[PDB]
């Protein structure tokens, strides 16, 4: 079972690094893939890649050994690197939703409105926010709880538990997850509404001669919307729910579950290439890249 658990960490890292390296490669190497949307996808893949190379491996050891082997500084840094990459990943998912919403519903306004220079600013902003919520508060000790038992883990270099004050766990969870989630729900809901509202106008046109039904394309778009919101929420909702719960009633949820829900979130980083890089141009580039 703990033999199975260690095997399961190995494939997680393998999938994350493989997938995300393959995406960045595809985009960087293929002129056809260097679009505006794929700029945001590139930001996402960078974030998830750093999760697989650094965040998850240092994580995997802390489960196996049951203690932090690299001293208090690298604990602090690894914690900051984790928070940064997760925040950048999820906030970038939120920007991709907005991007595709404009491109699908208001494509002509979008082309003049969203430039490559504007997208860079959006991307730079996302990472600057990730940095300021992770590195700034964690290195400067703002994330620290006053509690004596928490303060025992800060003094022990073998302890690298994630223990925060109230303010930080609320604020970081809102900024990394809840605001992005709300924006993703609102945005992708307007796509559904826009599509349903357009089918309504087609039926008004036909002078009571035809009523539209869901075709192949409408079922597929709705499945896609399902996978987008489903996998993102399944993966990160449990952990971020529990993360706020801990700040109030600390005993209620065990530590083995909390960490296991955080591992589920890292799984999303392996899922993202599969979801957001299915384009026929991506499918060609991937074959071309694998000989």
């Amino acid at each position, epitope marked *: 079972a703990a033999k199975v658990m260690s095997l399961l960490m190995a494939l997680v890292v393998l999938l994350i690094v493989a997938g995300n390296v393959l995406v960045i490669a595809a985009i960087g190497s293929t002129q056809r893939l260097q679009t505006l949307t794929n700029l945001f996808i590139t930001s996402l893949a960078c974030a998830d890649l750093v999760v697989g190379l650094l965040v998850v491996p240092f994580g995997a050891t802390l489960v196996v050994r049951g203690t932090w082997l690299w001293g208090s500084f690298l604990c602090e840094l690894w914690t900051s690197l984790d928070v940064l990459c997760v925040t950048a990943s999820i906030e970038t998912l939120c920007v991709i939703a907005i991007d595709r919403y404009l491109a699908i519903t208001s494509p002509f*306004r979008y082309q003049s409105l969203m430039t490559r220079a504007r997208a860079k600013v959006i991307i730079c902003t996302v990472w600057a926010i990730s940095a300021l919520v992770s590195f700034l508060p964690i290195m400067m000790h703002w994330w620290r709880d006053e509690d004596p038992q928490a303060l025992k883990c800060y003094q022990d270099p073998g302890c690298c538990d994630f223990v925060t004050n109230r303010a930080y766990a609320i604020a970081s969870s809102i900024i990394s997850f809840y605001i992005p989630l709300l924006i993703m729900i609102f945005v992708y809901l307007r796509v559904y509404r826009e599509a349903k509202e*357009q089918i309504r106008k087609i039926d008004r046109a036909s002078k009571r001669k035809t009523s539209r039904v869901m075709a192949m*394309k*409408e079922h*597929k*778009a709705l499945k896609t919307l399902g996978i987008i919101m489903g996998v993102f929420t399944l993966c990160w909702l449990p952990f971020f729910l529990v993360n706020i719960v801990n700040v109030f009633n600390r005993d209620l949820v065990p530590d083995w579950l909390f960490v296991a829900f955080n591992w589920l979130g890292y799984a999303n980083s392996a899922m993202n290439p599969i*979801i957001y890089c299915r384009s026929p141009d*991506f499918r060609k580039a991937f074959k071309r890249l694998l000989a």
Partner: nanobody
Amino acid sequence: QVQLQESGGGLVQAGGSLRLSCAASGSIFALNIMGWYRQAPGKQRELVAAIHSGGTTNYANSVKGRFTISRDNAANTVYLQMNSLKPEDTAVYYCNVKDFGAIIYDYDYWGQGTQVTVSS
């Protein structure tokens, strides 16, 4: 299978008018762009005009004030009403459909093309 059937092209005297018409038979997502592109001999393909499912439009500068794109409210059919034609407009005109059904990316359909020749 999606197919695009082009009609309305041909020979016409300069100063005259044509009305292209592309009827898309197949499964298309409600959100989409139907458009006309053209390729003059020894030139690259260029956008003539395009109309989104919503109703917003986009026209090239050369055809502004002359050409008008509109779509059948019921069927997947898009019309380009070309007036004040000039010999410069002579090209193979292609019908294009951008399907947004995958959300993250757009799938493209192209017509075989229809010839339009304007003599002086």
